[PDB]
Amino acid sequence: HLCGSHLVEALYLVCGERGFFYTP
Amino acid sequence: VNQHLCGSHLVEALYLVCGERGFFYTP
Amino acid sequence: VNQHLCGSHLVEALYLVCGERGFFYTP
Amino acid sequence: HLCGSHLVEALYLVCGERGFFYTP
Amino acid sequence: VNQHLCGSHLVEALYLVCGERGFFYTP
Amino acid sequence: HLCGSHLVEALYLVCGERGFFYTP
Amino acid sequence: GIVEQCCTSICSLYQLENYCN
Amino acid sequence: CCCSLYQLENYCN
Amino acid sequence: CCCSLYQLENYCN
Amino acid sequence: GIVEQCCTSICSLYQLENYCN
Amino acid sequence: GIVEQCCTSICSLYQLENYCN
Amino acid sequence: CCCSLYQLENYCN
Ligand SMILES: NCCc1c[nH]c2ccc(O)cc12
Ligand SMILES: NCCc1c[nH]c2ccc(O)cc12
Ligand SMILES: NCCc1c[nH]c2ccc(O)cc12
Ligand SMILES: NC(=[NH2+])NCCC[C@H](N)C(=O)O
Ligand SMILES: NC(=[NH2+])NCCC[C@H](N)C(=O)O
Ligand SMILES: NC(=[NH2+])NCCC[C@H](N)C(=O)O
Ligand SMILES: [Cl-]
Ligand SMILES: [Cl-]
Ligand SMILES: [Zn+2]
Ligand SMILES: [Zn+2]
């Protein structure tokens, strides 16, 4: 379903305002 | 806002730049 | 225009938000 | 060839001005 | 700048438009 | 690792200022 | 619709969901 | 599709 | 994930 | 080229195709 | 951080790398 | 490639 830069794109749609870590 | 659209491009850039390490984004 | 570039980001957002339902985009 | 958000990106390059439905 | 962000969208557009031929981008 | 429009996205992060050819 | 609304103010996942089928 | 750019034009408004 | 949009919300700040 | 043209006016699939090899 | 810096001036792969873990 | 970011730099102008 969500891999590589698509997972980061998915994270940014939800958290783009709150911010986040991406720690593979 | 052109900052939000911008952030979209930054996170994709960090994905590629940072690799196995990963990153923190916090606007 | 920053509206067209914007629309690019909206449709990708609707893709993910809408899922199996799908969406209509109409600028 | 064109799957997931790449298909939507493909649809937006052609129809981004005319608009469209995306009904999987 | 909204030109750089723009260029991002252009190259993705050329990818799809140009196909097997390919393209040159030069800002 | 990098295929289709992801390869072009990768090329643009490095060369987006210098410019480039994409000749598959 | 979605342009005039969501490309002036940053929309939310509620404002975006109104354009789903 | 998972077609072409020109075939995709069939889906616009 | 390679999950959902709502499950993804677990990772924000 | 493509920047100055296509990042001021919205280009078309004709204006974009001139940068193909 | 990264917004205020990197969405005013075009950043470099050095300026971007400071937000890696 | 379908390589690295640094190897990709070989293709710029
Ligand atoms: N909650 C932020 C939703 C979101 C993600 N990407 C976007 C782009 C434009 C917009 O109005 C909204 C968004
Ligand atoms: N027919 C619209 C072509 C198109 C798609 N994305 C674009 C981005 C910039 C631009 O000038 C043009 C485009
Ligand atoms: N060396 C250009 C790095 C880069 C790629 N995409 C970007 C987007 C925003 C930015 O500030 C910087 C970038
Ligand atoms: N706008 C986006 N990047 N959406 C996510 C697309 C998911 C994609 N099909 C994948 O390979 O994981
Ligand atoms: N700019 C774009 N999103 N282009 C479409 C890329 C197609 C991609 N190789 C796929 O998995 O279907
Ligand atoms: N921001 C980007 N487009 N990054 C490149 C993503 C690579 C992707 N996982 C692929 O299928 O090749
Ligand atoms: Cl943008
Ligand atoms: Cl993919
Ligand atoms: Zn953009
Ligand atoms: Zn992909």
Numbering used by the authors:
A (entry chain B), D (entry chain B), F (entry chain B): 5 to 28
B (entry chain D), C (entry chain D), E (entry chain D): 2 to 28
G (entry chain C), J (entry chain C), K (entry chain C): 1 to 21
H (entry chain A), I (entry chain A), L (entry chain A): 6 to 7, 11 to 21
Text taken from the publication that reported this structure:
Insulin is produced from a single chain pro-insulin and stored in pancreatic β-cells in storage granules (termed large dense core vesicles (LDCVs)) from which it is released into the bloodstream in response to elevated blood glucose levels.
A similar set of crystallization conditions yielded crystals of insulin in a ternary complex with serotonin and arginine (referred to here as InsSerArgT3R3). Despite the presence of arginine, the serotonin modes of binding in sites I are practically the same as in the Ins-Ser complex. Some serotonins in site III are bound in a fashion observed in InsSerT3R3; however, some of these ligands are flipped in both InsSerArgT3R3 crystal forms, i.e. the -OH and aminoethyl groups switch their positions. Arginine is accommodated there in channels within the T3 trimer, parallel to the hexamer 3-fold axis and opposite to R3 trimer sites I filled by serotonin, which leads to filling the voids around Zn2+ and His-B10. The flexibility of arginine is concentrated mostly around its -CαNH2COO− moieties, which form weak alternative HB to main chain groups of CysB7 and HisB5, also exhibiting some flipping around the Cα atom. In contrast, the guanidinium groups of the arginines are firmly engaged in extensive networks of HBs, which link them with side chains of GluB13, the side- and main-chain of HisB10, and the side chain of SerB9. This simultaneous binding of the two very different ligands to the T3R3 insulin hexamer polarizes this oligomer even further into two structurally distinct trimers, Arg3T3 and Ser6R3.
